[PDB]
């Protein structure tokens, strides 16, 4: 069932969302957005600045103060807001879902069977922590009753990256409120369209003033005046290693706000030779080229062990040449466009360097169409370490494949990079399989999958590819501020 | 390193320890213990009864009571205790193994490095937990604050076997004491010995008196006493499962007081052709003649894929004809005898049903010595499901190897029994190996091993091979007592 | 708002519900239901027995079965399931209330307001458990890969009491299928009606068939077939302490099947000279008459300090002289009938003997009306510890009135009983608030309130008042089994 | 019973501790390490730069590696080796408490009661978390059997301050070890001593070489080499918060490391009429006089409701009044030395701003002594809050006392400071006590004490006192990484 809208899309929301009210950019400037697809201009938003983003915490910080509804409130109601809040994105899925392709290039049937229900299913999930998040009571030295509060931090910028509008939307609002924070949101300049309608929905759903706040525009301008702002006392930021870096340092330079970072990969696969050859093939394939390769997670590096390298290659070429390129709303085209041009142009540049530094070019290898930022599907074969396609985050179609011989080099070559996002390993031997996956360093292992992600687990990365955990029980501690309450008394029995 | 005690053992302790004190039986009668390797008395220990069950439960009772000093002392202490008493029983390491070995007719390598090293190490992990059991905090509907305390039960009525005394001895008062709880223990008749020892131990290392009391004698006097008294608060016993039945309908006719059962067991291992298997072999070999066969866990139905089955087998009947028969206290010796006569008898009557019914007997099959209930090592093959020795706990060195062509098949002939208390699956197929161990209906699956016990693990029963679990973090819930504090304020802020 | 149904009621579902479709009692009897408050025949209901108890539980054991759609849908549907079953319980909110107060004796502004806001909030929150039940893995000693699964137990009889059918029904089938088991559930003889209606429902929102099945008839029969029963894993209960016993006994002699009860309680509060005086007044008194009386948690035992003791008997027994006996549907009324005679008549016996053993009668102490179990509201001072009305659970509205001048000695007498389900302290003193309610033997104990129930804390009895805890994160333990998975490999790292 | 040392002290370990041995700084350089008692030199301590980190970092990565004895040992292992390390810290207790005296000027009462109680208990408390660190296993949606391993995070430096540094030791190292950590630890210039006495330690009791390393010198040339480390996995620092930021800054334009920090508070109590007079004098006098002022939980700002201000400032005076200044070492000696210039003259710098800006001086005001950094101890009342003495953190003995009416503005007051370590209620009312410890905003509020710290509880600050918390279950996950690993399974079921 992908079904589809009747009538064509219209942009109804645009402006800076603060106190569940609608503003124009203080300075009244504001910025185009576009269809990658086309290259052509989709509207016009308003630009959001530091002084719109000091607006915006000002909202956070009252909705957040000591007494206020959304302080005061049964955690089962927050629960509730948040459940709502995803029946009503259901309600919309289909707009939301053409928006999504409209605006970030992605494939219309994976983002109405993927993202939107994953968007969905992620907001439950999150709705059902709310009355679940608990301290302790500590049996304490001494004569004492003591207990803790988790309780939530605050006031939480969080920057939205444009590869999963929706869905890293939610992965960062859905465990904030579930804790009780309030938000100061921006979304990525490239796609501020989809977010703009969820807060749409928000004020809809009955979310206090404040709670919520949305502010477009760009990274240099409004993203630097949440990271070094000095009343936001957390920022989540999903995006490269590069600006990651930037706002670790600016929220130590600034208030030593709270930082969590998801940032790039350089993903690697081992396949052992006892693998099952065609579902690591098939899994391997779109690990890397999912949603035009502009996933963190791309498997970028795959390790194949050499009795059956040749074997996997061919087919990997094969399932490679069988895409469609064309605009993502046209039902049975398979590939989309690049998001836009600095992409384009790094993507194009790194598939270059391939070829001069003496890769194995299997297909694809130059741009394509006349309009959007389309990249042929690129297979390299015959990679090796110093290359830059095998050290650097491509974020584009482009598989590279190398060979091994020896299990305990090929780990440390799959180790040996500062990423550290995710793996996997493709073996029917089970020691291998545990073996294996405890000695890669990489916050998330698929065995025999794939790219296979959902609420209920914890997500983040080891080393430069990130700081913390996003969902599971174990990502909601990174929205929670603990406060130890010890009151003496007369005396204490256990 | 197999040390040995250098003089003769000499038995001290005797009487029943209540308020660290020895008393005599309030009758005045005693009751003979015996090895059961040479079938002579070893001593004479205090008689309990009813009358003495209830000096210990008041001891029990004031030991607990609100303001005391095991009600008082800082969790931290409690924990200490516990270590204390571990370092202790290391120090008498060689004199409890000899004990153990000598009254319980355990092999002392085994008595030495794995019954005392489990002591210890299951009393150090207990004594960690102590101050680490917490309630919770918890966001309530409404203007309330509510948190919950993990109290204590109170006084915990405590049988223990005669097949592992020391062992369980610490499997039951460890976790029960960590968690603040008062013990009235009653050890097997025909073992006493060790615990009382254990005693002296738990005097020395200073818990406050009434906190453990020690009452040796008979099951259908003292442990009866026990599952039917009205000031007891909780019973754990580990047994047959028929004495099991009995106890939970004391407990229902008098208090209901809480029961934890650790039962028998008719543990099935279903070995794929794809197995490793010499491993196989090897593990389900210990796996059922481990301490004679006397273990809840005996992997008494081994079910082996027809096309490995006939080898299987026959380097199944060579391991088994391998064993040397005599005194647990000699070195070189590898079979000691069974614990008593009752049980001697079940065994050969068992194995007689074997034959008759039509198993082929591939070794063993009658007694051995002139003193000592020592029982030849047995293999039975051509094994069927209606056969007594494949329906009955055995209890006995007394193998059953059958055959099996269909997974689906296999799988419901394993789960086909009212016992569940544990299995294990032998393949090197991850999928198999995750799916059969989830479709087994026991309380603790082995993958590529077997008989494999940790502290750190739960352990029990499905079915009626148990309820409840002991050690792990979850077996430390049954010795907790969850009240609710909730409490009216003005205004709650998450 | 309290809205009611325009059109009288219909009553529709009477049968019994097993794989979602309606079935005869294999006998063809059927029992008649009554209205408390005009003794009118209401209906017939099919009359279960034994032999429909069996069908009932195959149902659940094939839909528990591995391969089910029960046992492997997403747990995030199994809570899916649950949130929709709340969703039409919310739709149906008018009618399910009326037959509440109709066939319950109910008032129904308690009904409609607190009833049903209960069961919907109780649902919605173990919705959100569903896929939030996780086990651990474990850093076993020794070189292997330790898990655990925290399973479904499987088919778990269910039986609900007359005096919050609704409530209980949803309390017990919450987290039991939010854990992933199958019920059996046997409705109070005297309330079968919104159990079935509730049924419909289930079918409706789309659960696998067997995965609920409701039998409706008599305690003595259906209720002895499930608790007896040879493949029923679990039985819940919540009754009479006396038919506690027997369930536990039951489950004993026949398949050691779990067991869970929450019971009686005769539960006390403390009354400090410094509280709240018209605060503690309040609660205690709605504490005591709530629902008629008809309460598990009734503070029956009100121990007021003696210099304040008049004082709060005067403001008493005025809060107690204000009720409007009559019809539950009718606006205005406040106090309903009792649910039947065998009730009506063991509160008017306990009655009798409280002005026999020579309470001080304040008010109240007889019947009222002509039909209907009506007892007037009563109100009984100078009341001592060997008392009846003291040691006996009324299960009616009848308030007992006690002083004292010790704390040490009313903390004895409120813990002088085999019961312990709750308690409250009514005080402004941190240091006793504390200490009082570390001292009390009761699941859970209310400061400066009484009565406060939510889904997000566990509850349950200390001693014969019930083993085990529902609701919160603890009760959801007492609905999984859980399975140890020990796997071999070469070589572990941390 | 305070004992002493019968021999005088002897300088023993003064050398860099790598891989179990003692190096020379790569330089060859020295640095002088004092007595702030009588500013005389006590011994020559080799001098660690980035290129001694440097061989410091390689060792811990090397013991950190895949398959070596830190990573494969058992985690109960880990955890003996910490209570071996607490024994043996208990066998030198003596020795350790003098050199922590004479080198960091603290009382030797304090020293051996407090300081060394606290090593040995929470050394022996993190010892029983190593075999309790577990993961999950996870119902994740689809076909995937999905488990967390919460692994090591790998090589941590960990910068300790000088104020407490035995303590600060081991609460870096205890939990870091316990985890499965390796380390690089760079206790403070001024305090070395006894950290290299602990490394001794830390080779008898077995820990395998490179597990952990101990680097003498200095902040701004080994502190940094740690900070901006490229192969350092996290750090963790306890101090100012101006170095703090630096930290962060460095920790983010190096190699994206976890950052824990724990720094500076300017912690406010708020003292409520009803409260205990005397309690709550005595607290907050020990509460902000401790260790001559150097906590960072000093209780540095007083809010005391107006109408017992005159009588609290009274009492405050009379206590400051009674203290005795020398040599830490000497019986009787209440007050020791502030630890060096650097702190002294600040100290002297904000008592002149008091003065000059206008508080009331009741008490102190000056140095003491001819040598040593005495300072006397200071109380000041009429503090206004734009004073520097209400504004910085002082280190030093110094009692701000202030006057409030309301209590919404003095929480308003009390929370109006970037820092947020810890805050003080004194009141005996129960709702007052939950509602004003709530809006605290502060990581340990303590209710009717001050200074209450044990390992059982987490501890750390809200805003610029500090990211992260140490101790408790939940400080033990900052010394995790999780790694999620899901595994393609044919078919799941719950
Ligand atoms: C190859 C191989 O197979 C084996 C089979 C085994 O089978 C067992 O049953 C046991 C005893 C397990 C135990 O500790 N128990 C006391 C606690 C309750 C259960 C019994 C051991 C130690 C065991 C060891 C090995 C080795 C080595
Ligand atoms: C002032 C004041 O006193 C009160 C006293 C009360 O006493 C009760 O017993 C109850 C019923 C609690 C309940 O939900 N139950 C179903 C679940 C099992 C236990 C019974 C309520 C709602 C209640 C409310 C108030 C208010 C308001
Ligand atoms: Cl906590
Ligand atoms: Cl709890
Ligand atoms: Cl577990
Ligand atoms: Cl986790
Ligand atoms: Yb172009
Ligand atoms: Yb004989
Ligand atoms: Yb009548
Ligand atoms: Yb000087």
Not at 239 to 255: C, D, H, P, Q, R
Not at 317 to 333: H, Q, S
């Amino acid at each position: 069932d992908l079904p589809v809208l009747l009538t064509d899309l219209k942009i109804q929301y645009t402006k800076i969302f603060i106190n569940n009210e609608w503003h124009d950019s203080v300075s009244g400037k504001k910025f185009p957005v576009f269809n990658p697809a086309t290259e052509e201009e989709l509207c016009q938003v308003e630009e959001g600045d530091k002084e719109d983003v000091d607006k915006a915490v000002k909202a956070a910080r009252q909705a957040f103060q000591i007494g206020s509804p959304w302080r005061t409130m049964d955690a089962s109601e927050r629960g509730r807001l948040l459940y709502k809040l995803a029946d009503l994105i259901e309600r919309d899925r289909l707009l939301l879902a053409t928006m999504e392709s409209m605006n970030g290039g992605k494939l219309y049937s994976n983002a109405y069977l993927n993202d939107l229900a994953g968007c969905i299913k992620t907001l439950r999930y999150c709705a059902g922590w709310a009355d679940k998040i608990q301290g302790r009571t500590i049996p304490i030295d001494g004569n004492f009753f003591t207990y803790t509060r988790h309780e939530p931090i605050g006031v939480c910028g969080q920057i939205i990256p444009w590869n999963f509008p929706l869905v890293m939307l939610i992965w960062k609002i859905g465990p904030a409120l579930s804790c009780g924070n309030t938000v100061v949101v921006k979304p990525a300049e490239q796609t501020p369209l989809t977010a703009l309608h969820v807060a749409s929905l928000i004020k809809e759903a009955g979310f206090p003033p404040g709670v919520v706040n949305i502010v477009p525009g760009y990274g240099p301008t409004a993203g630097a005046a949440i990271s070094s702002h000095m009343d936001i006392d957390k920022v989540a930021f999903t995006g490269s290693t590069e600006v990651g870096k930037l706002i670790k340092e600016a929220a130590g330079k600034s208030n030593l706000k709270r930082v969590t970072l998801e940032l790039g990969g350089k993903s690697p696969c081992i396949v052992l030779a006892d693998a099952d050859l065609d579902n690591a093939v098939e899994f391997a394939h779109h690990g890397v080229f999912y949603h035009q390769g502009q996933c963190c997670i791309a498997a970028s590096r795959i390790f194949v062990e050499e009795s059956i390298y040749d074997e996997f290659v061919r087919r990997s070429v094969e399932r490679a040449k069988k895409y469609i390129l064309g605009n993502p709303l046209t039902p049975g085209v398979t590939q989309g466009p690049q998001i836009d041009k600095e992409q384009y142009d790094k993507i194009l540049d790194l598939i270059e360097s391939g070829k001069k530094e003496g890769a194995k070019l299997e297909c694809g290898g130059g741009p394509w169409g006349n309009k959007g930022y389309f990249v042929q599907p690129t297979v390299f074969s015959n990679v090796t370490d110093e290359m830059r396609i095998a050290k650097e985050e491509i974020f584009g179609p482009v598989q590279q494949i190398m060979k091994f011989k020896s299990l305990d080099d090929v780990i440390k070559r799959a180790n040996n990079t500062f990423y550290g996002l995710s793996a996997g390993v493709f073996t029917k031997d089970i020691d291998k399989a545990i073996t294996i996956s405890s000695a890669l360093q990489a916050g998330t292992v698929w065995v025999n999958c794939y790219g296979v992600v959902s609420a209920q687990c914890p997500f983040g990365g080891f080393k430069m590819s990130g700081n913390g955990r996003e969902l599971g029980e174990y990502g909601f501690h990174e929205y929670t501020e603990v406060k130890t309450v010890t009151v003496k008394i007369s005396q204490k029995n256990s």
